[PDB]
């Protein structure tokens, strides 16, 4: 649905929003899903990740 | 927590993890908090952005 920035937020990247504080901003259904920053434990390496590509253990 | 790779995944960015089925991940605890990806009703640009930096309307 609607949300609202609270902060003002500069792209870092290619793929990430710039925004400023008090725009409207609307939810974009993704089949990825929301992305989580994850570790991984097998090979050591650390980044963002697509939640619907993994499930509990 | 701990999650499992239930699918392949190849970085497309800087920033995002690259993982092969059944990696072991562990979700790192971030001020950012989840990304979205949403879409801007004030300048019509759309891309990923932090979830703690927004709130509902």
Do not use: C
């Given at each position: 649905?609607?949300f609202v920035?609270?902060?003002?937020?500069?792209?870092?990247?290619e793929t990430?929003?710039?925004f400023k504080?008090?725009?409207?901003?609307?939810?974009?259904?993704?089949?990825?899903?929301?992305?989580?920053?994850?570790?991984?434990?097998?090979?050591?390496?650390?980044?963002?990740?697509?939640?619907?590509?993994?499930?509990?253990?």
């Amino acid at each position: 649905m609607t949300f609202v920035a609270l902060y003002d937020y500069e792209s870092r990247g290619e793929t990430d929003l710039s925004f400023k504080k008090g725009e409207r901003l609307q939810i974009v259904n993704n089949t990825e899903g929301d992305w989580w920053l994850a570790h991984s434990l097998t090979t050591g390496r650390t980044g963002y990740i697509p939640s619907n590509y993994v499930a509990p253990s």
